[PDB]
PDB file of all heavy atoms in Angstrom:
ATOM      1  N   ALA A  28      17.979  -2.952  34.708  1.00 13.24           N
ATOM      2  CA  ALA A  28      16.791  -3.267  33.880  1.00 13.24           C
ATOM      3  C   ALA A  28      17.114  -3.305  32.424  1.00 13.24           C
ATOM      4  O   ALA A  28      17.961  -2.629  31.974  1.00 13.24           O
ATOM      5  CB  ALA A  28      15.735  -2.206  34.116  1.00 13.24           C
ATOM      6  N   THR A  29      16.421  -4.167  31.691  1.00 11.23           N
ATOM      7  CA  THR A  29      16.464  -4.087  30.212  1.00 11.23           C
ATOM      8  C   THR A  29      15.162  -3.421  29.799  1.00 11.23           C
ATOM      9  O   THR A  29      14.086  -3.887  30.190  1.00 11.23           O
ATOM     10  CB  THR A  29      16.599  -5.490  29.711  1.00 11.23           C
ATOM     11  OG1 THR A  29      17.959  -5.919  29.976  1.00 11.23           O
ATOM     12  CG2 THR A  29      16.421  -5.607  28.222  1.00 11.23           C
ATOM     13  N   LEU A  30      15.185  -2.333  29.026  1.00  7.09           N
ATOM     14  CA  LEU A  30      13.971  -1.775  28.540  1.00  7.09           C
ATOM     15  C   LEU A  30      13.560  -2.446  27.244  1.00  7.09           C
ATOM     16  O   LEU A  30      14.270  -2.299  26.215  1.00  7.09           O
ATOM     17  CB  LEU A  30      14.080  -0.276  28.361  1.00  7.09           C
ATOM     18  CG  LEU A  30      14.072   0.632  29.618  1.00  7.09           C
ATOM     19  CD1 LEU A  30      12.702   0.628  30.278  1.00  7.09           C
ATOM     20  CD2 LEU A  30      15.144   0.201  30.580  1.00  7.09           C
ATOM     21  N   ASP A  31      12.419  -3.136  27.235  1.00  6.59           N
ATOM     22  CA  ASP A  31      11.969  -3.935  26.102  1.00  6.59           C
ATOM     23  C   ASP A  31      10.819  -3.200  25.441  1.00  6.59           C
ATOM     24  O   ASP A  31       9.703  -3.189  25.931  1.00  6.59           O
ATOM     25  CB  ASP A  31      11.536  -5.335  26.572  1.00  6.59           C
ATOM     26  CG  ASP A  31      12.749  -6.064  27.195  1.00  6.59           C
ATOM     27  OD1 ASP A  31      13.782  -6.193  26.437  1.00  6.59           O
ATOM     28  OD2 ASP A  31      12.716  -6.475  28.388  1.00  6.59           O
ATOM     29  N   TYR A  32      11.195  -2.625  24.308  1.00  2.79           N
ATOM     30  CA  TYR A  32      10.233  -1.797  23.598  1.00  2.79           C
ATOM     31  C   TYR A  32       9.711  -2.457  22.363  1.00  2.79           C
ATOM     32  O   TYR A  32      10.437  -3.247  21.667  1.00  2.79           O
ATOM     33  CB  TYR A  32      10.945  -0.501  23.173  1.00  2.79           C
ATOM     34  CG  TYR A  32      11.431   0.387  24.232  1.00  2.79           C
ATOM     35  CD1 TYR A  32      12.689   0.899  24.174  1.00  2.79           C
ATOM     36  CD2 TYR A  32      10.567   0.968  25.157  1.00  2.79           C
ATOM     37  CE1 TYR A  32      13.151   1.861  25.039  1.00  2.79           C
ATOM     38  CE2 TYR A  32      11.027   1.914  26.102  1.00  2.79           C
ATOM     39  CZ  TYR A  32      12.299   2.336  26.057  1.00  2.79           C
ATOM     40  OH  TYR A  32      12.802   3.230  26.977  1.00  2.79           O
ATOM     41  N   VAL A  33       8.474  -2.130  22.020  1.00  3.60           N
ATOM     42  CA  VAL A  33       7.871  -2.582  20.835  1.00  3.60           C
ATOM     43  C   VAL A  33       7.335  -1.372  20.104  1.00  3.60           C
ATOM     44  O   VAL A  33       6.484  -0.628  20.568  1.00  3.60           O
ATOM     45  CB  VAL A  33       6.712  -3.596  21.056  1.00  3.60           C
ATOM     46  CG1 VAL A  33       6.130  -4.035  19.708  1.00  3.60           C
ATOM     47  CG2 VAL A  33       7.140  -4.705  21.902  1.00  3.60           C
ATOM     48  N   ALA A  34       7.920  -1.152  18.925  1.00  6.77           N
ATOM     49  CA  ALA A  34       7.609  -0.007  18.161  1.00  6.77           C
ATOM     50  C   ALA A  34       7.021  -0.381  16.872  1.00  6.77           C
ATOM     51  O   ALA A  34       7.462  -1.384  16.231  1.00  6.77           O
ATOM     52  CB  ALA A  34       8.813   0.823  17.899  1.00  6.77           C
ATOM     53  N   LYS A  35       6.026   0.413  16.479  1.00  5.17           N
ATOM     54  CA  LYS A  35       5.325   0.145  15.205  1.00  5.17           C
ATOM     55  C   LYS A  35       5.363   1.260  14.202  1.00  5.17           C
ATOM     56  O   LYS A  35       4.985   2.388  14.500  1.00  5.17           O
ATOM     57  CB  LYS A  35       3.846  -0.201  15.444  1.00  5.17           C
ATOM     58  CG  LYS A  35       3.641  -1.646  15.806  1.00  5.17           C
ATOM     59  CD  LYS A  35       2.160  -1.991  15.704  1.00  5.17           C
ATOM     60  CE  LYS A  35       1.767  -2.191  14.255  1.00  5.17           C
ATOM     61  NZ  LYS A  35       0.330  -1.749  14.167  1.00  5.17           N
ATOM     62  N   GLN A  36       5.717   0.863  13.013  1.00  4.26           N
ATOM     63  CA  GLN A  36       5.808   1.706  11.822  1.00  4.26           C
ATOM     64  C   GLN A  36       4.561   1.328  11.011  1.00  4.26           C
ATOM     65  O   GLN A  36       4.434   0.145  10.515  1.00  4.26           O
ATOM     66  CB  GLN A  36       7.069   1.331  11.056  1.00  4.26           C
ATOM     67  CG  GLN A  36       7.271   2.073   9.711  1.00  4.26           C
ATOM     68  CD  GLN A  36       8.631   1.747   9.098  1.00  4.26           C
ATOM     69  OE1 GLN A  36       9.177   0.662   9.347  1.00  4.26           O
ATOM     70  NE2 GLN A  36       9.160   2.660   8.336  1.00  4.26           N
ATOM     71  N   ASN A  37       3.592   2.233  10.995  1.00  7.22           N
ATOM     72  CA  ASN A  37       2.267   1.949  10.432  1.00  7.22           C
ATOM     73  C   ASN A  37       2.170   2.255   8.928  1.00  7.22           C
ATOM     74  O   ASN A  37       2.464   3.360   8.475  1.00  7.22           O
ATOM     75  CB  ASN A  37       1.194   2.694  11.181  1.00  7.22           C
ATOM     76  CG  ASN A  37       0.948   2.077  12.529  1.00  7.22           C
ATOM     77  OD1 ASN A  37       0.782   0.855  12.648  1.00  7.22           O
ATOM     78  ND2 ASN A  37       1.087   2.821  13.507  1.00  7.22           N
ATOM     79  N   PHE A  38       1.782   1.229   8.158  1.00  6.64           N
ATOM     80  CA  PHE A  38       1.552   1.378   6.751  1.00  6.64           C
ATOM     81  C   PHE A  38       0.100   0.985   6.306  1.00  6.64           C
ATOM     82  O   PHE A  38      -0.212   1.109   5.156  1.00  6.64           O
ATOM     83  CB  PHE A  38       2.558   0.548   5.859  1.00  6.64           C
ATOM     84  CG  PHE A  38       3.958   1.024   5.953  1.00  6.64           C
ATOM     85  CD1 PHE A  38       5.045   0.099   6.228  1.00  6.64           C
ATOM     86  CD2 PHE A  38       4.248   2.311   5.793  1.00  6.64           C
ATOM     87  CE1 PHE A  38       6.311   0.584   6.289  1.00  6.64           C
ATOM     88  CE2 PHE A  38       5.513   2.800   5.912  1.00  6.64           C
ATOM     89  CZ  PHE A  38       6.583   1.882   6.133  1.00  6.64           C
ATOM     90  N   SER A  39      -0.741   0.515   7.189  1.00  6.94           N
ATOM     91  CA  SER A  39      -2.056  -0.052   6.834  1.00  6.94           C
ATOM     92  C   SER A  39      -2.923   0.991   6.146  1.00  6.94           C
ATOM     93  O   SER A  39      -3.705   0.690   5.217  1.00  6.94           O
ATOM     94  CB  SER A  39      -2.812  -0.623   8.038  1.00  6.94           C
ATOM     95  OG  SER A  39      -2.991   0.353   8.980  1.00  6.94           O
ATOM     96  N   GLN A  40      -2.626   2.238   6.459  1.00  2.76           N
ATOM     97  CA  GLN A  40      -3.293   3.462   5.863  1.00  2.76           C
ATOM     98  C   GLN A  40      -3.013   3.640   4.387  1.00  2.76           C
ATOM     99  O   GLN A  40      -3.789   4.362   3.675  1.00  2.76           O
ATOM    100  CB  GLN A  40      -3.057   4.672   6.776  1.00  2.76           C
ATOM    101  CG  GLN A  40      -1.648   5.329   6.682  1.00  2.76           C
ATOM    102  CD  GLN A  40      -0.641   4.752   7.621  1.00  2.76           C
ATOM    103  OE1 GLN A  40      -0.835   3.627   8.166  1.00  2.76           O
ATOM    104  NE2 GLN A  40       0.426   5.510   7.926  1.00  2.76           N
ATOM    105  N   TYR A  41      -1.943   3.053   3.866  1.00  2.00           N
ATOM    106  CA  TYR A  41      -1.606   3.200   2.525  1.00  2.00           C
ATOM    107  C   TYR A  41      -2.079   2.025   1.631  1.00  2.00           C
ATOM    108  O   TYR A  41      -1.770   2.039   0.423  1.00  2.00           O
ATOM    109  CB  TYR A  41      -0.070   3.323   2.388  1.00  2.00           C
ATOM    110  CG  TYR A  41       0.469   4.495   3.147  1.00  2.00           C
ATOM    111  CD1 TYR A  41       1.386   4.300   4.240  1.00  2.00           C
ATOM    112  CD2 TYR A  41       0.054   5.809   2.898  1.00  2.00           C
ATOM    113  CE1 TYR A  41       1.872   5.433   4.951  1.00  2.00           C
ATOM    114  CE2 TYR A  41       0.566   6.887   3.627  1.00  2.00           C
ATOM    115  CZ  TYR A  41       1.461   6.708   4.678  1.00  2.00           C
ATOM    116  OH  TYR A  41       1.956   7.788   5.396  1.00  2.00           O
ATOM    117  N   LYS A  42      -2.798   1.099   2.177  1.00  2.00           N
ATOM    118  CA  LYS A  42      -3.124  -0.080   1.453  1.00  2.00           C
ATOM    119  C   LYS A  42      -3.870   0.309   0.184  1.00  2.00           C
ATOM    120  O   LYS A  42      -4.839   1.013   0.263  1.00  2.00           O
ATOM    121  CB  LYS A  42      -3.988  -1.055   2.247  1.00  2.00           C
ATOM    122  CG  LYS A  42      -4.131  -2.397   1.509  1.00  2.00           C
ATOM    123  CD  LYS A  42      -4.609  -3.520   2.405  1.00  2.00           C
ATOM    124  CE  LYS A  42      -4.716  -4.788   1.548  1.00  2.00           C
ATOM    125  NZ  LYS A  42      -4.869  -6.000   2.417  1.00  2.00           N
ATOM    126  N   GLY A  43      -3.340  -0.134  -0.941  1.00  2.00           N
ATOM    127  CA  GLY A  43      -3.997   0.183  -2.232  1.00  2.00           C
ATOM    128  C   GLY A  43      -3.745   1.558  -2.834  1.00  2.00           C
ATOM    129  O   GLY A  43      -4.302   1.877  -3.882  1.00  2.00           O
ATOM    130  N   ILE A  44      -2.918   2.394  -2.158  1.00  3.78           N
ATOM    131  CA  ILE A  44      -2.513   3.699  -2.707  1.00  3.78           C
ATOM    132  C   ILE A  44      -1.894   3.549  -4.072  1.00  3.78           C
ATOM    133  O   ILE A  44      -1.264   2.509  -4.351  1.00  3.78           O
ATOM    134  CB  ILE A  44      -1.508   4.344  -1.673  1.00  3.78           C
ATOM    135  CG1 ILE A  44      -1.424   5.840  -1.829  1.00  3.78           C
ATOM    136  CG2 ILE A  44      -0.159   3.761  -1.681  1.00  3.78           C
ATOM    137  CD1 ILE A  44      -0.628   6.482  -0.719  1.00  3.78           C
ATOM    138  N   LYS A  45      -2.061   4.593  -4.891  1.00  7.30           N
ATOM    139  CA  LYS A  45      -1.373   4.765  -6.124  1.00  7.30           C
ATOM    140  C   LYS A  45      -0.404   5.939  -6.064  1.00  7.30           C
ATOM    141  O   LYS A  45      -0.631   6.949  -6.726  1.00  7.30           O
ATOM    142  CB  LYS A  45      -2.356   4.917  -7.291  1.00  7.30           C
ATOM    143  N   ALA A  46       0.684   5.786  -5.314  1.00  7.41           N
ATOM    144  CA  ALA A  46       1.610   6.852  -5.121  1.00  7.41           C
ATOM    145  C   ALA A  46       2.430   7.101  -6.375  1.00  7.41           C
ATOM    146  O   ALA A  46       2.712   6.181  -7.108  1.00  7.41           O
ATOM    147  CB  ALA A  46       2.502   6.585  -3.917  1.00  7.41           C
ATOM    148  N   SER A  47       2.823   8.349  -6.594  1.00  7.89           N
ATOM    149  CA  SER A  47       3.657   8.763  -7.671  1.00  7.89           C
ATOM    150  C   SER A  47       5.032   8.139  -7.588  1.00  7.89           C
ATOM    151  O   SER A  47       5.502   7.857  -6.461  1.00  7.89           O
ATOM    152  CB  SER A  47       3.790  10.276  -7.777  1.00  7.89           C
ATOM    153  OG  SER A  47       4.595  10.834  -6.739  1.00  7.89           O
ATOM    154  N   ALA A  48       5.735   8.013  -8.724  1.00  9.02           N
ATOM    155  CA  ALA A  48       7.082   7.519  -8.676  1.00  9.02           C
ATOM    156  C   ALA A  48       7.953   8.469  -7.873  1.00  9.02           C
ATOM    157  O   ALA A  48       8.886   8.007  -7.152  1.00  9.02           O
ATOM    158  CB  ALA A  48       7.635   7.335 -10.078  1.00  9.02           C
ATOM    159  N   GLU A  49       7.686   9.775  -7.942  1.00 12.17           N
ATOM    160  CA  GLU A  49       8.407  10.742  -7.186  1.00 12.17           C
ATOM    161  C   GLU A  49       8.158  10.637  -5.670  1.00 12.17           C
ATOM    162  O   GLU A  49       9.058  10.785  -4.874  1.00 12.17           O
ATOM    163  CB  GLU A  49       8.051  12.179  -7.675  1.00 12.17           C
ATOM    164  CG  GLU A  49       9.022  13.249  -7.225  1.00 12.17           C
ATOM    165  CD  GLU A  49       8.393  14.621  -7.193  1.00 12.17           C
ATOM    166  OE1 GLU A  49       7.348  14.866  -7.847  1.00 12.17           O
ATOM    167  OE2 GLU A  49       8.931  15.479  -6.464  1.00 12.17           O
ATOM    168  N   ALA A  50       6.940  10.360  -5.261  1.00 14.47           N
ATOM    169  CA  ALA A  50       6.654  10.149  -3.856  1.00 14.47           C
ATOM    170  C   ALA A  50       7.367   8.897  -3.335  1.00 14.47           C
ATOM    171  O   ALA A  50       8.000   8.904  -2.257  1.00 14.47           O
ATOM    172  CB  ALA A  50       5.164  10.000  -3.685  1.00 14.47           C
ATOM    173  N   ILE A  51       7.288   7.815  -4.067  1.00 14.01           N
ATOM    174  CA  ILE A  51       7.862   6.521  -3.652  1.00 14.01           C
ATOM    175  C   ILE A  51       9.341   6.690  -3.566  1.00 14.01           C
ATOM    176  O   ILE A  51       9.943   6.136  -2.589  1.00 14.01           O
ATOM    177  CB  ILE A  51       7.450   5.444  -4.682  1.00 14.01           C
ATOM    178  CG1 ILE A  51       5.977   5.133  -4.562  1.00 14.01           C
ATOM    179  CG2 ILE A  51       8.340   4.217  -4.483  1.00 14.01           C
ATOM    180  CD1 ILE A  51       5.360   4.650  -5.871  1.00 14.01           C
ATOM    181  N   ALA A  52       9.932   7.430  -4.458  1.00 12.94           N
ATOM    182  CA  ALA A  52      11.375   7.692  -4.413  1.00 12.94           C
ATOM    183  C   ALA A  52      11.858   8.388  -3.114  1.00 12.94           C
ATOM    184  O   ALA A  52      13.032   8.242  -2.748  1.00 12.94           O
ATOM    185  CB  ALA A  52      11.838   8.406  -5.673  1.00 12.94           C
ATOM    186  N   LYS A  53      11.043   9.131  -2.424  1.00 11.59           N
ATOM    187  CA  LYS A  53      11.464   9.735  -1.120  1.00 11.59           C
ATOM    188  C   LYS A  53      11.637   8.667  -0.008  1.00 11.59           C
ATOM    189  O   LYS A  53      12.102   8.938   1.069  1.00 11.59           O
ATOM    190  CB  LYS A  53      10.457  10.801  -0.723  1.00 11.59           C
ATOM    191  CG  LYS A  53      10.439  11.924  -1.762  1.00 11.59           C
ATOM    192  CD  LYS A  53       9.579  13.089  -1.366  1.00 11.59           C
ATOM    193  CE  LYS A  53       9.830  14.333  -2.221  1.00 11.59           C
ATOM    194  NZ  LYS A  53       9.362  15.524  -1.437  1.00 11.59           N
ATOM    195  N   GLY A  54      11.117   7.478  -0.250  1.00  9.72           N
ATOM    196  CA  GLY A  54      11.340   6.369   0.669  1.00  9.72           C
ATOM    197  C   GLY A  54      10.592   6.314   1.947  1.00  9.72           C
ATOM    198  O   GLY A  54       9.544   6.962   2.111  1.00  9.72           O
ATOM    199  N   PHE A  55      11.139   5.520   2.886  1.00  9.72           N
ATOM    200  CA  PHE A  55      10.425   5.185   4.130  1.00  9.72           C
ATOM    201  C   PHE A  55      11.496   5.134   5.164  1.00  9.72           C
ATOM    202  O   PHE A  55      12.466   4.243   5.035  1.00  9.72           O
ATOM    203  CB  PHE A  55       9.672   3.856   3.988  1.00  9.72           C
ATOM    204  CG  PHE A  55       8.774   3.855   2.799  1.00  9.72           C
ATOM    205  CD1 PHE A  55       9.202   3.329   1.610  1.00  9.72           C
ATOM    206  CD2 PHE A  55       7.590   4.552   2.822  1.00  9.72           C
ATOM    207  CE1 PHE A  55       8.426   3.394   0.444  1.00  9.72           C
ATOM    208  CE2 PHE A  55       6.788   4.676   1.637  1.00  9.72           C
ATOM    209  CZ  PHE A  55       7.220   4.106   0.437  1.00  9.72           C
ATOM    210  N   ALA A  56      11.367   5.997   6.141  1.00  9.65           N
ATOM    211  CA  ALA A  56      12.305   6.029   7.259  1.00  9.65           C
ATOM    212  C   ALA A  56      11.608   5.873   8.582  1.00  9.65           C
ATOM    213  O   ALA A  56      10.478   6.332   8.676  1.00  9.65           O
ATOM    214  CB  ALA A  56      13.049   7.314   7.295  1.00  9.65           C
ATOM    215  N   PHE A  57      12.245   5.159   9.511  1.00  8.34           N
ATOM    216  CA  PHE A  57      11.765   4.985  10.857  1.00  8.34           C
ATOM    217  C   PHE A  57      12.831   5.464  11.805  1.00  8.34           C
ATOM    218  O   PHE A  57      14.001   5.057  11.695  1.00  8.34           O
ATOM    219  CB  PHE A  57      11.493   3.514  11.155  1.00  8.34           C
ATOM    220  CG  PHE A  57      10.736   3.305  12.430  1.00  8.34           C
ATOM    221  CD1 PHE A  57       9.404   3.735  12.509  1.00  8.34           C
ATOM    222  CD2 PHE A  57      11.307   2.721  13.558  1.00  8.34           C
ATOM    223  CE1 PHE A  57       8.676   3.555  13.620  1.00  8.34           C
ATOM    224  CE2 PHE A  57      10.570   2.590  14.727  1.00  8.34           C
ATOM    225  CZ  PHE A  57       9.277   3.042  14.758  1.00  8.34           C
ATOM    226  N   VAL A  58      12.464   6.334  12.797  1.00  7.91           N
ATOM    227  CA  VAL A  58      13.343   6.904  13.707  1.00  7.91           C
ATOM    228  C   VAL A  58      13.045   6.475  15.082  1.00  7.91           C
ATOM    229  O   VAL A  58      11.907   6.707  15.510  1.00  7.91           O
ATOM    230  CB  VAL A  58      13.369   8.486  13.627  1.00  7.91           C
ATOM    231  CG1 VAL A  58      14.263   9.054  14.749  1.00  7.91           C
ATOM    232  CG2 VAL A  58      13.850   8.913  12.283  1.00  7.91           C
ATOM    233  N   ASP A  59      14.017   5.980  15.815  1.00  8.14           N
ATOM    234  CA  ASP A  59      13.878   5.846  17.284  1.00  8.14           C
ATOM    235  C   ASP A  59      14.789   6.779  18.059  1.00  8.14           C
ATOM    236  O   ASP A  59      16.031   6.797  17.800  1.00  8.14           O
ATOM    237  CB  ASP A  59      14.139   4.423  17.729  1.00  8.14           C
ATOM    238  CG  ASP A  59      13.855   4.222  19.207  1.00  8.14           C
ATOM    239  OD1 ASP A  59      14.538   4.825  20.123  1.00  8.14           O
ATOM    240  OD2 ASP A  59      12.926   3.468  19.496  1.00  8.14           O
ATOM    241  N   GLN A  60      14.276   7.646  18.909  1.00 10.52           N
ATOM    242  CA  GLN A  60      15.056   8.592  19.646  1.00 10.52           C
ATOM    243  C   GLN A  60      14.900   8.339  21.118  1.00 10.52           C
ATOM    244  O   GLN A  60      13.894   8.726  21.732  1.00 10.52           O
ATOM    245  CB  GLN A  60      14.679  10.005  19.201  1.00 10.52           C
ATOM    246  CG  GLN A  60      14.942  11.235  20.062  1.00 10.52           C
ATOM    247  CD  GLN A  60      16.354  11.617  20.063  1.00 10.52           C
ATOM    248  OE1 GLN A  60      16.666  12.674  19.540  1.00 10.52           O
ATOM    249  NE2 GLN A  60      17.222  10.771  20.638  1.00 10.52           N
TER     250      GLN A  60
END
């Protein structure tokens, strides 16, 4: 079998956020385990 996965990294919750430069600097990571 081939396992065909579809994974979603959700950002819609941040739409229009005014994040700090320090927050933004921690970045964005997605992990698949």
